[PDB]
Every structure is written in C-alpha cells, then in structure tokens.
Amino acid sequence: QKLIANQFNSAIGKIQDSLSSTPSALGKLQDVVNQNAQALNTLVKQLS
Amino acid sequence: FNKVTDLICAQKFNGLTVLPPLLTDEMI
Amino acid sequence: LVKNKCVNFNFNGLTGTGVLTESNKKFLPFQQFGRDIADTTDAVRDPQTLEILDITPCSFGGVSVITPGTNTSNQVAVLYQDVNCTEV
Ligand SMILES: *[C@@H]1O[C@H](CO)[C@@H](O)[C@H](O)[C@H]1NC(C)=O
Numbered sequence A: 001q002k003l004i005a006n007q008f009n010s011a012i013g014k015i016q017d018s019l020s021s022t023p024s025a026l027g028k029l030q031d032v033v034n035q036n037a038q039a040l041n042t043l044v045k046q047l048s
Numbered sequence B: 001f002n003k004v005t006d007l008i009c010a011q012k013f014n015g016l017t018v019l020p021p022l023l024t025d026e027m028i
Numbered sequence C: 001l002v003k004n005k006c007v008n009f010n011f012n013g014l015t016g017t018g019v020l021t022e023s024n025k026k027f028l029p030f031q032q033f034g035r036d037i038a039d040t041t042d043a044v045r046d047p048q049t050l051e052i053l054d055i056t057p058c059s060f061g062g063v064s065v066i067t068p069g070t071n072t073s074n075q076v077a078v079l080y081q082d083v084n085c086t087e088v
Helices: A002-021 A023-044 B008-012
Strands: C006-009 C016-022 C043-045 C052-056 C063-066 C077-080
Antiparallel strands (some): C063 C077
C-alpha cells in the first residue's frame, strides 16, 4: 500500500510536470479552438 | 486553463455573436 | 464629433456605422486607419484634430425570449444577447 501510494503520488506529480513542460500536450483542444478561429477569420475575410 | 489560449470579438464586429456556454467553467 | 453614440461616420473616404470612443492606441504620426487581424476598421485618427478613436460596432445581438408553455402562462421574459442594458 505504501509503495502504491508513493507511485500514485509520483505519477500524478509527473502529470503536472508533463502538462507544464509540454504546452502542446493540449493540442487536441487547441486545434479545436484554432479551427473555429480560422473558420471565423475566413468568414470575415470574405467581406473584403 | 493556463495552457490553452480579444480576437473573437473582432469577428463579432461583423454580425457574429458568440453565445456563452450554458455550463460555466466554474460549474463544469 | 460626438462620442459614445452609434453614428454613421464618414472620416475622409472611410465610411461606416458604429460607436466611436477615445482610445489609447498610439498611432504613428502618419497613420489614419485602424485595423485588426480580421482586416476590419477598428480605430480612426480624427482628421482635423489628431485624436485616436476606436470604433466599436454599435450594439447588436439576438433577441431570445424566455417563455414557459403557452398553456402554462403567457408571461414572457426576453434576453438581448451580446449587449448590456441599453433601451429595455
Ligand atoms: C483644425 O480645425 C479644427 C476645427 O476648427 C480644430 O479643432 C483643430 O484644433 C484645428 N487644428 C488641427 C489640429 O488641425
């Protein structure tokens, strides 16, 4: 139990570090926002 | 929330309303 | 010039509708227009006095209506989307 708890806490800490060290870790979300912005930007570049 | 990135208002300038989500991020 | 009112401005050749407000945009001493990533007119230098005015498109938005079933009541609330409280 002690070893599992230590491994669990360490793995959670690495999750924090992995998401911090890797901002792209959230590419699947950021791409979604980018696609929406691109579509909206394209939709505004049509009135020019 | 700090790893995901006014511009949406710039499209709002031309008839493009952006409705807010029903479940606010705090309630989510 | 009148600020904080939706007007049909015609600064030089540029025409357009919107509310115009004093801004802190530091135009270079030669620039006239204002623009953004959307390539839309954002601000404007006042031609006859060198002041900076950003152009917010004056408020629009959907008008949603909050209603229970007609058989329940005919009372109605309305929701002006994307706008503050202006005309009621
Ligand atoms: C130009 O004329 C306008 C209107 O009389 C005046 O407000 C302004 O001070 C004059 N000088 C400039 C800045 O061109």
